[PDB]
Design an enzyme around this catalytic site. Structure first.
Site, PDB file in Angstrom:
ATOM      1  N   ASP A  35       0.827  -1.199   0.000  1.00  0.00           N
ATOM      2  CA  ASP A  35       0.000   0.000   0.000  1.00  0.00           C
ATOM      3  C   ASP A  35       0.861   1.248   0.000  1.00  0.00           C
ATOM      4  O   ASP A  35       1.369   1.643   1.046  1.00  0.00           O
ATOM      5  CB  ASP A  35      -0.885  -0.017   1.251  1.00  0.00           C
ATOM      6  N   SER A 199      -0.481  15.502 -12.119  1.00  0.00           N
ATOM      7  CA  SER A 199      -0.749  15.126 -13.492  1.00  0.00           C
ATOM      8  C   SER A 199      -0.970  16.387 -14.328  1.00  0.00           C
ATOM      9  O   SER A 199      -1.489  17.388 -13.840  1.00  0.00           O
ATOM     10  CB  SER A 199      -1.974  14.204 -13.550  1.00  0.00           C
TER      11      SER A 199
END
EC number: 3.4.23.22
Length: 330
Positions: A35, A199
């Site tokens: 994770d 992004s």
């Protein structure tokens, strides 16, 4: 040194991925959910409340000759999906795919919440976010990666998650046969303890690319792709009959639909998530309403590039002095 381990979807929907991890001496192999959005390595154990164990493999520290109670240490964690666990702490030897760390903090669960109990396939989590998020008190502990880093050939790990198929976590090296083209690296902020990056934009299907900054985290421990409501609305508007359902808890779509791809930007590069990756199947058994793999982050407080996004790429988690993230197509 290096390590390499196969990671396998827990079910037919890729709800999560499990990777075998050797703990203790003799080894006790548990299947853990790696994770990159948390920083605790915790396991179901011989100390876990009996009624809260249902099919998981447990770690029994009393059977490990290298286990040592970390005196006075406790841990307690809550995850973004509303689940939680807590307990005490041992140090022990932990190996992943041939890479061994001695003295790793292995957090032993005394309590786990219902969704952990109900999932027989996940024996615990192995956190790979930054150690500043580790919950052990009163002395915070380091992640497996943090402990291994200095010994690694290169201070990196990579995630290569499969779509409906196994994939690979590598530590200490970049497998240049595992991706196509080049890896594009992008800046990371560690201020919130995550692999947080920006992004450069998105496209829906064969649509034009929208240049827009989207701050979010690369999180292998989250199933779906959570993005701003504007982006998500633009995506589902291209699917006839799709709608946001408050009762179901997100966007649903007719199971008869053909889903468009979703592209996200990494610098000037582009990662394309095929439409099928965005299908999470019937909302309930036998339903013709299917759950979407792209959902709004509104009210999460952060955008999350979860497995839906990451499995479309070969992802480098570069833990150099100034960390960065790399993405390649594959």
């Amino acid at each position: 040194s290096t390590g390499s381990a196969t990671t396998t979807p827990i079910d037919s929907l890729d709800d999560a991925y499990i990777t075998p991890v050797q703990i203790g001496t003799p080894a006790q192999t548990l299947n853990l959910d790696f994770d990159t959005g948390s920083s605790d390595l915790w396991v179901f154990s011989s100390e876990t409340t009996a009624s809260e164990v249902d099919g998981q493999t447990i770690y029994t520290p009393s059977k490990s000759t290298t286990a040592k109670l970390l005196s006075g240490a406790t841990w307690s964690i809550s995850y973004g999906d509303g689940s939680s666990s807590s307990g005490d702490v041992y140090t022990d030897t932990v190996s992943v795919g041939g890479l061994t760390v001695t003295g790793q903090a292995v957090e032993s669960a005394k309590k786990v919440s219902s969704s952990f109990t109900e999932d027989s396939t996940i024996d615990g989590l192995l956190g790979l976010a930054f150690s500043t998020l580790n919950t052990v008190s009163p002395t915070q502990q380091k992640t497996f990666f943090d402990n291994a880093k200095a010994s690694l050939d290169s201070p990196v790990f990579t995630a290569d998650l499969g779509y409906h198929a196994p994939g690979t976590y590598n530590f200490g090296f970049i497998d240049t046969t595992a991706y196509t083209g080049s890896i594009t690296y992008t800046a990371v902020s560690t201020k919130q303890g995550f692999w947080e990056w920006t992004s450069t934009g998105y496209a829906v299907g064969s649509g034009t690319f929208k240049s827009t900054s989207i701050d979010g985290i690369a999180d292998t421990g989250t199933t779906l792709l959570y993005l701003p409501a504007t982006v998500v609305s633009a995506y589902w508007a291209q699917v006839s009959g799709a709608k946001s359902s408050s009762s179901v808890g997100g966007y649903v779509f007719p199971c008869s639909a053909t889903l468009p791809s979703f592209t996200f930007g990494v610098g000037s590069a582009r990662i394309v998530i095929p439409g099928d990756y965005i299908d999470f199947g019937p909302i309930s058994t036998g339903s013709s309403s299917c759950f979407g793999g792209i959902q709004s982050s509104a009210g999460i407080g952060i955008n999350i590039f979860g497995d839906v996004a990451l499995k479309a790429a070969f992802v480098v988690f570069n833990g150099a002095t100034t960390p960065t993230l790399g993405f390649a197509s594959k």
